Amino acid sequence: XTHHRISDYXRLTXLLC
Amino acid sequence: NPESADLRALAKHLYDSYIKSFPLTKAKARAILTGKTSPFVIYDMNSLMMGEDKIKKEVAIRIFQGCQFRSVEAVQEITEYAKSIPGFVNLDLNDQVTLLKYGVHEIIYTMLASLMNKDGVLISEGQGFMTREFLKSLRKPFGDFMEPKFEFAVKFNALELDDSDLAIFIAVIILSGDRPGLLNVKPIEDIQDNLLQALELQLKLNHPESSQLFAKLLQKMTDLRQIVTEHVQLLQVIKKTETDMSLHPLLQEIYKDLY
To answer: Which residue numbers delimit the NR LBD domain (chain B)?
Structure first.
């Protein structure tokens, strides 16, 4: 989901979420 | 005993999840390296050449980038494993991201040891073996990029951990309360405390002859932090000499403002 630094972690967030 | 049961059940859950998350386990790597099942050996430029046909720009750059691509696949598998660790996905999402950012390379090196011996490393999902000496032969500044990993692996492998041990140890590493920038340390330390007791019980059951194994393993966690530090510095150097070389964007996310 969304988090404070998401705009710097597109790819990692893709994997986690 | 209901706590004992819980702890054994946790060890079992993590082992089951590890197996699901990581195709190339230590058991599988050891079977290949000892012949119970051989990899194409790359020991020089000619064998690298012959290797490109048999298994899957300049050579040193190609090998380094190969290492990065393999790291990217490990980040994927580790992220999946982390999601299976009880409590992890219930943490603050900012904190989950911080735990992965700082945890993933330490796990990479831990699990890389499974594929290594003192003379080289399994590559291409166990279909090839690249000699340590060959990796040392590459031109500056790539000549040494694997040496810290080999050195760690030879010492780590001497503990003779199995995959059931490793599953708990890597969980302990990810759930580290001391990562920079964590917002809520206490819930992380609480989970890690359960994992540490699971680990202690696992090692007592699984390595009764190894009287100080738990303590020895806690020390390795600290050692892992230094290889990562040294790797990031190594990348700084390479980012200087080699401006044309593209870096992997997932890794750039991980490395950005790391240490």
So the answer is: 6-257
Round the CA-based radius of gyration of chain B to a whole number and report it.
19
Solving technique for this entry?
Answer: X-ray
Tell me how crowded residue B54 is: count the other CB atoms within 10 A of its CB: 12
Q: What is the largest CA-CA distance in chain A?
A: 17
Within B145-184, residue ranges assigned H as helices are 147-157, 163-174
Distance from CA of B112 to the nearest CA of A (A): 21
Q: Which amino acid, one-letter code, is at B79?
A: T
Q: Burial code of B19-41, b = ≥16 C-beta within 10 A, e = fewer?
A: eebbebbbebbbebbeeeeebbb
Cβ atoms within 10 Å, residue B146: 23
What six digits make up the tokens of B36? 């119970």
The reply to whether residue A12 touches residue B76, judged by beta carbons under 8 angstroms, is no
Q: Where are the beta strands (DSSP E) in chain B?
A: 40-42, 116-117, 120-123, 128-131
3-state secondary structure of B138: coil
All residues of chain A having their beta carbon less than 8 Å from the beta carbon of residue B256 are 8
Tell whether B88 is in a known binding site: no
Residue with tokens 């806690």: B218
In units of Å, what resolution does this entry have? 1.8
Please report, as a single letter, which amino acid is at residue B214: F
d(CA B13, CA B84): 9
CB contact, 8 Å: B249 with chain A?
yes
How far apart (Å, rounded) are the C-alpha atoms in residues B52 and B127? 12
The two tokens of residue B190 are 């609480």
Residue of A nearest to B88 (CA): A16
Domains of chain B are 3-258 (1.10.565.10)
